[PDB]
């Protein structure tokens, strides 16, 4: 009802968690949607969305999104059609289905989206977590960004397998590195994004030579704190950040 | 003596760095290096009438010795080395010497020039000129020797550095890890306002694992590998500005 935790709704067990405030990241958003057919229809729902919470699950090849915004029936009614591949609304809930995408508006301020393979979660199962949320575990700063609405426009990512990810961000061919979770926080500076990340190292030590070289490939400050590798003052353009976000599914 | 001379025998054996610059295609770099030390036009004017420059840097006595082949008519030489620019001259055979605070210059024949630059311990000019008659015999790697004989057909700059450790860190702008390595060969060619280069660096018992190898190749954006105990980098790049600074910083 009023106490809904968006992260409880996308669900636990994901490989990547995403928090994406729209204000201040409109350009990044528009760059990402430029590939899809529904790009006219999506930029509409997006214009009515304040924040997007997302979880990606590799095993079932799916993304689940929860949006906070304003979605009256009059607005949803226009966008939805059979000409765009959809089928379908009922007891205050607008429910929509296509080959690879499910959408529902369970209330005037929430939207839910499941996209992916034929093994993606049923929508009624995701909606049940409005009554009985999951309890995923998320890093402190990720949690802070999620509750901090409007005082911050940081995009937050929590990626369980950082080794397998970090290759995409570093211009690498996929190497399979023996590293753990990464947190990644990005903020728009003009046509660019500043980022800071933390990487779990486990018991393997990272000496200064490697520390130095990474720092040069990335053009950023670098340091070890306990068993974490910390990268700060890194920068990436809005354009390359777009494709990297898309590569999660690909 | 005029019959034929080996410019490398004239600059002398035992140097810490050997250098070869063909002037065509490398005018800008040469200018930069000259500017980083000397402001006098005479040397710039000499360079303009030179086809090739052979150099040797000597760390102990802190000096460059340079041999230029070119065209230096009396009409040209008479109009440089003016006393108002701080040049003293002296006749004697018929060879004239030009001396200044840090630079000594001679033009022993209309097609040769000799320059000695550096500290007060720099070689005497007449000692260097004696090597027109009795040359030294420094040892250089094959490609360095190929470059020296191939003016007109190649515009590649060549360096041969005895202590490659110290130089490579300046060149790649790394920190000087200073676990001294062997000799370095370095060949560079001009592309716009930067230089393309390949190098090999003797490693010794020193080791370079694959992780560092791949990282360096990405840092430099160049193809790299290890042929034996030689590290090879191909298609690295450096700005002319930086290359001029790295060279000229051998002195002082």
Curated annotation (Swiss-Prot), chain B:
The keyword Transport appears for this protein: no
PTM statement from Swiss-Prot or TrEMBL: Palmitoylated upon expression of a fusion protein with first 46 residues fused to PhoA in E.coli.
Uses in industry and biotechnology: Recognized by sera from 43/43 syphilis patients, it shows promise as a diagnostic antigen. In diagnostic tests for syphilis this protein exhibits a sensitivity of 98% and a specificity of 100%. A fusion with TP0453 (residues 32-287 of TP0453 fused N-terminally to residues 38-450 of TP0326) exhibits a sensitivity of 98% and a specificity of 99%, and both proteins exhibit superior accuracy in classifying analytical false-positive samples than a commericially available test, making them candiates for diagnosis.
Chain intervals for the UniProt region annotation (Amphipathic helix 7): 164-172
Gene Ontology CC terms: cell outer membrane
Compartments where found: Cell outer membrane
Start and end residues of each stretch annotated as Amphipathic helix 9: 240-249
Region (Amphipathic helix 4): 74-83
Effect annotated for changing residue 171 to E: Partitions into detergent and aqueous phase, decreased vesicle association
Keyword Hydrolase attached: no
Mutagenesis or variant effect for residue 219 to E: No longer partitions into detergent, no vesicle association, decreased dimer formation
Region listing for Amphipathic helix 1, in residue ranges: 7-11
Protein purpose: Might be involved in ligand transport, alters membrane permeability at acidic pH (4.0 to 5.5). Incubation of the non-lipidated form with lipid vesicles increases their permeability.
Domain remark from Swiss-Prot or TrEMBL: Forms a U-shaped beta-half-barrel with a large hydrophobic cavity (3549 Angstroms(3)). The cavity is opened when amphipathic helices 2, 3 and 9 move away from helices 7 and 8. Has 5 potential amphipathic helices (P1 to P5, residues 56 to 63, 155 to 162, 194 to 202, 240 to 250, and 270 to 279 respectively); P2, P3 and P5 form helices in the presence of lipid vesicles.
Protein name: Outer membrane protein TP0453
């Amino acid at each position: 009802k009023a106490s809904v935790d968006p992260l409880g709704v996308v669900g636990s067990g994901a490989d990547v968690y995403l928090y994406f405030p729209v204000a201040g990241n409109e350009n990044l958003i528009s760059r990402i949607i430029e590939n899809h057919e529904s790009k006219a229809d999506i930029k509409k729902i997006v214009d009515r969305t304040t924040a997007v919470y997302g979880a990606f699950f590799a095993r079932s090849k799916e993304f689940r999104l929860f949006g906070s915004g304003s979605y009256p029936y009059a607005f949803t009614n226009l966008i939805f059609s059979r000409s765009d591949g959809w089928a379908s609304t009922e007891h205050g809930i607008t429910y929509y289905e296509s080959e690879h995408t499910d959408v529902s508006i369970p209330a005037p301020h929430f939207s839910c989206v499941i996209f992916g393979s034929s093994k993606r979660e049923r929508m009624s199962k995701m909606l049940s977590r409005l009554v009985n949320p999951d309890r995923p575990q998320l890093p402190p700063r990720f949690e802070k960004e999620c509750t901090s609405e409007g005082t911050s426009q940081t995009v937050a990512l929590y990626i369980k397998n950082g080794g397998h990810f970090i290759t995409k961000l570093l211009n690498f061919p996929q190497l399979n590195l023996p590293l753990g979770a990464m947190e990644l926080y990005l903020t728009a500076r003009r046509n660019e994004y500043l980022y800071t990340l933390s990487l779990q190292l486990g018991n393997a030590k990272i000496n200064f030579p490697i520390q130095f070289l990474i720092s040069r490939v990335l053009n950023a400050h670098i340091h070890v704190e306990g068993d974490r590798l910390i990268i700060e003052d890194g920068t990436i353009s809005a354009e390359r950040l777009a494709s990297v976000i898309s590569s999660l599914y690909s």
